[PDB]
Amino acid sequence: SELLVNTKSGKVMGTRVPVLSSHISAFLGIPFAEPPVGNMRFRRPEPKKPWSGVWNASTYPNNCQQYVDEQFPGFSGSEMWNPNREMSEDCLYLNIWVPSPRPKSTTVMVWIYGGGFYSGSSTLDVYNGKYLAYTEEVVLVSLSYRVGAFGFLALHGSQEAPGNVGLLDQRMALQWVHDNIQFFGGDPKTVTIFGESAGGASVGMHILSPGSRDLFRRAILQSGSPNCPWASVSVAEGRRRAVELGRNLNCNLNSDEELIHCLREKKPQELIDVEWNVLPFDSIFRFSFVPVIDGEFFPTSLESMLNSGNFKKTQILLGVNKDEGSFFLLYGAPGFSKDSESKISREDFMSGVKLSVPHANDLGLDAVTLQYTDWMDDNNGIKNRDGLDDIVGDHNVICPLMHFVNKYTKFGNGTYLYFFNHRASNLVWPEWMGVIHGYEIEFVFGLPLVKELNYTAEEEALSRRIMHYWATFAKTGNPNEPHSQESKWPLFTTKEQKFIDLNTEPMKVHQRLRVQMCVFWNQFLPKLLNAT
Ligand SMILES: *[C@@H]1O[C@H](CO)[C@@H](O)[C@H](O)[C@H]1NC(C)=O
Ligand SMILES: *[C@@H]1O[C@H](CO)[C@@H](O)[C@H](O)[C@H]1NC(C)=O
Ligand SMILES: C[C@@H](c1cccc(O)c1)N(C)C
């Protein structure tokens, strides 16, 4: 039966789901690792022991343990990201949407969700891959991994909690796709891993990690790169935060074994309840447990790797949104409210730049402010607000990505860059947040197609363009149709620096995406902070 597939791990029973008045197969909740429960907490992922009998892969699995967002109870704009499945440490599973009839060897796309490495679920609605699988005729796989301390606590040196296990969970899923996607009609030699936010950063991290390069063909990163200031930490920092977490639950801190044991005896929600008390600074866009530069998963500093071309060469398709910062200021910076225009004062503006650039000393905070302030109108609430919005976005998403892309292209086999700047017509967040972090996702997964979602005709059009770009890129290594009569997406070159818009208007090509502010963020401020 089309809904029955035999994989090296065992047989699997899927289900037929309806999609835009048609149907495709869906194998939901396939296990790709042994449940990281019990003494395996913090440990590296172990291969899911094969099973005999048919596995019911007709419904979604549990979502890993994670901090749920209760900032706006009932608000759909914030809960569409909260887990919609019973949380559980036993969450390592993957989902595959398969066209019908089943292909024989089509392009495959594995999706890695975002969430600041402390949250994320493959079962969210905007992550439903039936529309993409169906529309572009591709086998869509969305994996999952351990977020938070559960997947990132890092006591370097120990084998019980080495760290980066979350990324290992990911790789394990990628290996399972390499080894079995063929039985689902997928071409294991044409897998394109794509993610957003922490997911995009992850993608870049597999491109950098030798132990992963061999497991995928192409790569797509959205609103995030491996070198983002929040994506990784040093073993030292990671260790420090581990102890702090332990100290928060009154753990014996005499040895790693003493500490690790204590953390394993704590219920999941106990670690979650104090997770945020470990950060080193009062800051915005910073998460407790994230990938550490251990020397293993990451041979050396991400920068030297980038500089020495020590990374998988291939084609990549990445980009950012116009208002990345807005979401983190609403949640932490003083002055922003979900229900107001959030006009910011010079007092609060300053406080924002403080939270935004946590590692900066006074001179640094000064440089930033000077660089993002209209002194001919230093008291404009809208300016102070948007300026702050920009700061959070450039520093944390746009500029780090631009560094990456600039460093990669110099060794890559093709680079395509996009600047997504269309605000959905159905967005329920305040107008001031603009093109919000993670809202390009819905167009990538073609939600504008299903009418009951209330998108505009053009928005549906946009979705389809994107979906095709992504798919066509995954299949070929280029987002463009071989011979076409409509708009070429220029290749990004270290010389031209060309890039494109992604909105409901006629796409237009541009150059040097936010160079100005990124020469400051990537080249100046660093020098500044180091000299001082
Ligand atoms: C799992 O499969 C069983 C029969 O094999 C089916 O009745 C059930 O709906 C599926 N998922 C559920 C409800 O747990
Ligand atoms: C990609 O690699 C192929 C073969 O190695 C080469 O012919 C082509 O010019 C490369 N393209 C880019 C953009 O580097
Ligand atoms: C909170 C989170 C987020 C919020 C909204 C959409 C996303 O994809 C991710 N950041 C921190 C990674």
Q: CA–CA separation, 415 vs 408, rounded Å?
A: 8
Q: What is the dihedral of CA 344, 348, 354, 357, to 10 degrees?
A: 0
Q: Which helix (H) or strand (E) holds 517?
A: helix 515-519
Question: Cβ–Cβ contacts within 10 Å for residue 509, how many?
Answer: 13
* Cβ atoms of residues 284 and 324 within 8 Å: no
**Which pair of structure tokens corresponds to residue 219?**
């790569």
Q: ∠ at Cα 147 (143, 151), nearest 5°?
A: 100
Quick check: CB of 414 below 6 Å from ligand 2? Answer: yes
From the candidates 232, 437, 459, 463, give the one annotated as an active-site residue. 437
Residue 301 CB-density burial (10 A; 0-12 exposed, 13-18 middle, 19+ buried): middle
Kind of pairing between the strands at 414-420 and 315-321: parallel
**Which pair of structure tokens corresponds to residue 157?**
């040196």
Q: CA–CA separation, 515 vs 402, rounded Å?
A: 9
Quick check: CB of 58 below 6 Å from ligand 1? Answer: yes
Question: Cβ–Cβ contacts within 10 Å for residue 456, how many?
Answer: 13
* Cβ atoms of residues 185 and 191 within 8 Å: no
* Cβ atoms of residues 275 and 149 within 8 Å: yes
Give the dihedral sign, CA 84/86/87/89.
Answer: negative
Is 197 considered catalytic here? yes
Pocket test for ligand 1, best of 13, 27, 56, 85 (most atoms within 8 A of CB): 56
Q: CA–CA separation, 91 vs 88, rounded Å?
A: 6
- The 8-class DSSP code of residue 26 comes to E
Q: What is the dihedral of CA 259, 262, 278, 168, to 10 degrees?
A: 80
Pocket test for ligand 3, best of 117, 222, 437, 439 (most atoms within 8 A of CB): 437
Q: CA–CA separation, 414 vs 477, rounded Å?
A: 8
Strands (E), 294-403: 315-321
Alpha-carbon distances, residue 208 vs 96, 155, 240, 267, 513 (angstroms): 26, 22, 25, 34, 24
Q: CA–CA separation, 117 vs 230, rounded Å?
A: 9
Residue matched to tokens 């897998």: 191
Tell me how far the alpha carbon of residue 194 lies from the centroid of ligand 2, in angstroms: 21
Is 481 considered catalytic here? no
* Cβ atoms of residues 135 and 461 within 8 Å: no
Contacts of 237 (CB under 8 A, 6+ apart): 280, 292
Q: ∠ at Cα 205 (200, 208), nearest 5°?
A: 135
Chain breaks in the chain (C to N over 2.5 A) after: none
Here the contacts of 72-78 (C-beta below 8 Å, separation 24 or greater) are 72/338, 75/338, 75/428, 76/428, 77/427, 77/428, 77/429
Closest atom of ligand 2 to CA, residue 415: 13
Domain ranges for the chain, please list them: 1-532
Residue ID of nearest Cα to ligand 2 atom 9: 413
- The 8-class DSSP code of residue 9 comes to T
- The 8-class DSSP code of residue 501 comes to E
Backbone angles phi, psi at 195, to 5 degrees: -145, 175
Kind of pairing between the strands at 509-511 and 498-502: antiparallel
Residue ID of nearest Cα to ligand 3 atom 8: 438
CB-defined site of ligand 3, < 6 Å: 81, 114-116, 196-198, 327, 437-438
3-class state of residue 373 by DSSP: coil
CATH of 1-532, one of 3.40.50.1820, 3.40.50.10440, 3.40.50.970, 3.40.50.80: 3.40.50.1820
- The 8-class DSSP code of residue 54 comes to E
